[PDB]
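Board notes, transcribed. Complex of a protein with 3T4.
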Amino acid sequence: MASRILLNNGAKMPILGLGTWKSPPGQVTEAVKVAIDVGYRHIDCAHVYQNENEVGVAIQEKLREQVVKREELFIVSKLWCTYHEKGLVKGACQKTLSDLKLDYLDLYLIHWPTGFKPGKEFFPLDESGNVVPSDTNILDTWAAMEELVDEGLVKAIGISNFNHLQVEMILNKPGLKYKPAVNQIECHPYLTQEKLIQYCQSKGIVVTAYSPLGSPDRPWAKPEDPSLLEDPRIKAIAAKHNKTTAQVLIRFPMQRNLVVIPKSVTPERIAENFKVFDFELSSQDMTTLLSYNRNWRVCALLSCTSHKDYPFHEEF
Ligand SMILES: NC(=O)c1ccc[n+]([C@@H]2O[C@H](COP(=O)([O-])OP(=O)(O)OC[C@H]3O[C@@H](n4cnc5c(N)ncnc54)[C@H](OP(=O)(O)O)[C@@H]3O)[C@@H](O)[C@H]2O)c1
Ligand SMILES: N#Cc1ccc(CNC(=O)c2ccc(Cl)cc2OCC(=O)O)cc1[N+](=O)[O-]
């Protein structure tokens, strides 16, 4: 299948990208170097991941080695929750650019629809464990995102973890200048997102599936939580194709016309994860994987469930 998907700005976005959350600064430079060598062009980043410097080191080295040119790369980052104020947006984007050593991003996302109290702390909590919000709203933050495109800092803007009503809010904004190009959402066999995907795709919004392997390294995991990579039913599908479970889990969203961004810092896995253009999941496989849905979110926090813009009260 084609390796890129057309965005609403006429640019093409590689459907397979490298995730970088939890890729430690001490190990991510090599991860990104290897990724580039074996063919990844899309890298998913974020200021909150606190490793954009080191990702930037890897990109700079591969540009200088003449392994890739800037135009071939598709670099994504995200505006963190503590920078939703219209006056903070450009500075946040420029810090990301400075750290990545880039002069533009291919795509910049609102990381979560929620604004958090501005300050040094990424996750300000109050004495009883609830996040401290900011008095910002989706539409004003979007307007600030639009300014970034008009200033040439970013080629496309989008959103992440927005429910369909929050997407609709942007789409219905009087004087909207740019539609969101992408909604990046959690998506895998345990959370198949049929309704939000159908909604987004019907609105001309490209969907990126995050945590496609089930984010086994997430810091709030419980030992009794369901584990995708270890699911015997998926291992069986993989063995049938002489592929790994991870390869099946990456190919799955690709065949749903989604972009997918598996994370690894392990060079062997980074290479393995990219080798998913040489097989196809059958109808039956696709159906079987979809049937494993349990509306189970690996990326959601109790501490945010009182925020006025918490996205997961809605069905989708
Ligand atoms: N927008 C958002 O709110 C949001 C939320 C979550 C994630 N994301 C993005 O999506 C990316 C991917 O999601 P994720 O990081 O949550 O988790 P994921 O990609 O579902 O899983 C990554 C985990 O799987 C392991 N792994 C990778 N390849 C493997 C393989 N072939 N075999 C066995 N294990 C393998 C990794 O180990 P090693 O790295 O140790 O090899 C790591 O522990 C993130 O890094 C981030 O870029 C965005
Ligand atoms: N609102 C909200 C909200 C915010 C965050 C989360 C979960 N994410 C994190 O706790 C997180 C924290 C630090 C880092 Cl570096 C990465 C993280 O996740 C990966 C990512 O967000 O990309 C959940 C919610 N929420 O409303 O459910």
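Residues 230 and 245 are 8 Å apart (CA to CA). The first helix runs from residue 25 to 38.
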